[PDB]
């Protein structure tokens with residue numbers, strides 16, 4: 001009844017493509033574009 | 049995948065895959081496919097988990113209907129021709145097929161069901177060709193008032209937009225039962241070394257030691273040897289059939 | 293189709309003593325000059341076994357498959373064809389099929405519409421089943437087959453069907469001659485099917501004496517002797 | 533319960549499925565005519581347009597037994613209201629046929645407008661000889677003679693048909709329960725059932 | 732403003748100039764909505780300011796089709812007759828601004844416009860669009876009283892000239908009798924084309 005709103009609460013996000021594990025009490029803040037393939041992203045979204 | 053013809057929207061061909069090693073690496077590393085969405089698993093590491101059976105369903109739908117095939121989506125094609133369960137263990141693959149499924153003047157070889165009494169149950173194929181009736185008064189087997197045929201054809205032409213261009217969709221479902229697994233990913237193997245203290249993993253037989261040539265004569269079916277102390281003292285290489 | 297045959301004469305089948313045969317390699321391990329003791333389903337030494345005759349008089353009973361079966365045959369002219377495994381041996385349940393026809397061996401898992409008297413018809417006539425809905429498995433390989441003795445052990449555990457075999461020349465109409473011969477593994481299939489009964493297949497002469505025996509496997513402890521070369525030469529039953 | 537709307541929705545779906553392909557190959561054929569005018573091209577445009585008009589007229593008939601008060605949604609009501617219109621067929625056969633043959637007359641001879649120069653050595657037509665005379669000029673006499681010569685000829689033959697066309701348009705206007713031809717054309721800005729956002 | 736470009740079919744299928752293979756075409760810029768995601772665009776455009784504006788019209792007035800392309804097939808249209816034809820024209824209004832040309836390279840970076848230079852642009856666009864608004868309104872008034880019956884049937888054409896003296900402020904050079912039809916000089920009149928659409 002506070003966070004959720006009828007218009008839509010979209011200010012909460014979670015990292016999903018870490019590519020590695022987390023040590024206990026680790027803080028990850030980098031938002032660089034994840035690469036899932038051999039081709040580098042070069043700052044643009046696309047395949048992998 | 050590399051097939052000349054695909055099944056109709058209402059009648060989707062289903063093929064079962066078993067007892068073979070599946071090289072998924074060719075799939076998600078290929079850029080030719082336009083849609084590669086995996087539900088419940090990741091495209092990477094997918095070749096490290098074993099299943100018992102794999103089902104492949106193939107059909108050709110519109111460009112705007114690719115988003116309609118997914119767990120929870122609603123619509124006409126999804127509800128009345130091929131409906132997916134809320135839970136899914138597999139991947140959905142689709143790509144443009146304008147060069148093959150589009151013909152000048154219209155390619156009317158593909159039919160589909162647009163209106164049905166209720167949404168189709170998951171993994172159900174509907175091939176019924178019956179005169180639909182939405183009116184209280186029965187028309188008695190002949191098309192009349194409030195009695196319309198539910199199957200109509202698709203028109204594919206080379207000049208249509210990408211939103212209407214034909215797309216071939218293959219749905220791979222990995223099912224797991226209380227049976228031994230039959231499909232697995234390829235087992236990568238490295239080159240072997242000898243006369244050096246190394247860590248070896250011989251077909252699941254892990255250990256540490258020094259591998260040298262052997263004078264023992266294993267029986268043709270035997271794999272590894274054992275001493276009186278019940279310790280592995282010999283082994284045969286899976287690739288080259290010699291004793292170490 | 294299948295021909296309903298009733299020309300046989302009803303006779304009471306004899307029994308025999310399975311003196312020593314029925315030993316197979318338990319695991320895929322090489323041992324030399326070592327006496328090893330193991331607990332596994334074996335056929336007890338000097339065991340009560342049935343007797344069946346072919347060629348006249350012939351019979352194809354639907355014998356049970358409770359925990360494992362030792363199958364042997366000292367017959368000649370390859371009258372023995374194959375076996376059928378399953379629970380109901382009809383179209384409502386899956387059944388295992390193994391035959392050795394003139395050219396190849398067929399292994400399938402289908403809900404065959406088995407006839408009451410499966411029978412193979414020189415020339416041969418496949419007359420054992422009528423329909424097959426959908427088969428989830430197939431496999432073709434080398435056929436398994438003065439007289440010749442073929443011994444088999446059929447084990448079905450944790451969804452895996454295991455087969456062992458051994459061939460040796462035999463003479464005289466004697467039944468189960470004395471001797472020792474270990475059964476090497478042949479084939480393993482991960483079907484995962486329940487099996488309760490089984491039946492054998494033969495061929496009629498026109499439209500060569502054949503005999504086979506059926507044992508049963510029980511949980512026992514054995515002491516196997518390994519030679520330096522790696523072959524099992526002798527064994528001891530620990531509860532005889 | 534079988535509300536009429538639940539069958540009108542299926543009818544509209546069938547109409548959309550047919551009309552999309554009909555207009556798409558019609559428009560594809562329409563493009564082939566603008567970029568290529570030949571004897572074959574005009575014929576297939578005529579065939580496609582005739583088939584499309586006939587199909588639209590059949591669907592206008594099929595919209596009739598499904599009324600407009602059976603749909604409460606304004607947006608859905610708009611579709612049926614647009615589809616329910618038939619046209620000039622509401623009157624008797626003879627009056628409709630005379631309408632079609634009159635419209636043919638204003639198609640053929642009307643496009644052949646001609647003017648006569650006082651001097652026979654120059655002969656100019658409306659496109660583009662006359663247009664230069666009225667628009668691209670800096671004198672009085674040329675414009676005067678062009679106006680006199682053009683208006684002297686075209687009025688006599690073309691005047692009588694206008695009154696018959698007007699009265700017939702009024703008769704079709706009354707046939708569709710409209711007060712007059714003005715109400716026939718004033719119906720494009722009428723909003724009913726929306727509320728205060730009306731006109 | 733967020734509007735994307737024309738689809739890929741524009742680049743290959745649509746031709747930006749008249750073909751020279753002997754085929755004759757209609758060189759009027761046209762707006763085509765073929766449907767099914769297929770869109771094609773035709774004009775014999777040239778490197779001129781008027782064609783520079785019509786290029787943005789044809790690009791921008793088609794953009795309206797892309798806006799409501801997600802609507803149902805019977806709702807794939809503009810709000811009314813005037814909205815669709817007014818969306819395109821306001822596009823070229825910004826493309827003719829001096830700042831847009833200065834930032835687009837069509838004007839020098841040090842270019843300065845004088846208020847006397849602005850005077851021409853007012854008169855030009857007034858003379859093109861605005862100057863006929865009283866004329867268009869009063870002509871449609873004439874038609875409306877013609878449609879309403881205020882003008883008696885025997886003076887249908889003579890009151891066009893009669894009120895022209897006082898109200899329209901245009902004097903005729905030679906009076907004409909009842910047989911003459913001034914509206915017959917326009918091709919659009921015979922084909923039943925509305926005139927309130929422009930207003």
Ligand SMILES: *[C@@H]1O[C@H](CO)[C@@H](O[C@@H]2O[C@H](CO)[C@@H](O)[C@H](O)[C@H]2NC(C)=O)[C@H](O)[C@H]1NC(C)=O
Pocket residue numbers: 286287288289
């Ligand atoms: C596994 O597949 C390879 C692919 O050719 C077979 O090739 C062997 O390759 C090694 C070295 O690369 C050679 O020494 C062998 O002579 C090759 N064998 C043959 C038959 O060409 C290899 O034999 C296969 N292994 C098994 C056990 O079948």
Ligand SMILES: *[C@@H]1O[C@H](CO)[C@@H](O)[C@H](O)[C@H]1NC(C)=O
Pocket residue numbers: 306307308309340341
């Ligand atoms: C075991 O076989 C012998 C051989 O005839 C005989 O004692 C008998 O048939 C069998 N014993 C039974 C059935 O209890």
Ligand SMILES: *[C@@H]1O[C@H](CO)[C@@H](O)[C@H](O)[C@H]1NC(C)=O
Pocket residue numbers: 393394395396397398416418
């Ligand atoms: C034996 O089986 C094979 C298939 O495995 C078949 O091609 C062949 O015709 C069969 N022969 C006879 C005599 O049944």
Ligand SMILES: *[C@@H]1O[C@H](CO)[C@@H](O)[C@H](O)[C@H]1NC(C)=O
Pocket residue numbers: 296407408
């Ligand atoms: C004939 O075969 C059929 C097949 O099952 C069945 O009726 C029965 O087994 C036979 N009939 C007899 C033995 O009378």
Ligand SMILES: *[C@@H]1O[C@H](CO)[C@@H](O)[C@H](O)[C@H]1NC(C)=O
Pocket residue numbers: 383384385386403425426
């Ligand atoms: C195979 O046949 C069985 C009938 O025993 C049926 O239940 C099953 O659905 C069939 N499978 C396929 C893939 O047709």
Ligand SMILES: *[C@@H]1O[C@H](CO)[C@@H](O)[C@H](O)[C@H]1NC(C)=O
Pocket residue numbers: 486
């Ligand atoms: C096989 O038997 C086991 C128990 O012995 C039972 O749990 C299972 O449901 C059976 N499966 C079939 C297909 O009969």
Ligand SMILES: *[C@@H]1O[C@H](CO)[C@@H](O)[C@H](O)[C@H]1NC(C)=O
Pocket residue numbers: 519521
């Ligand atoms: C052991 O095997 C070797 C190699 O075939 C053979 O020469 C030797 O005779 C065998 N010895 C015994 C006791 O089996």
Ligand SMILES: [Zn+2]
Pocket residue numbers: 762788789791792793815816819
């Ligand atoms: Zn426009």
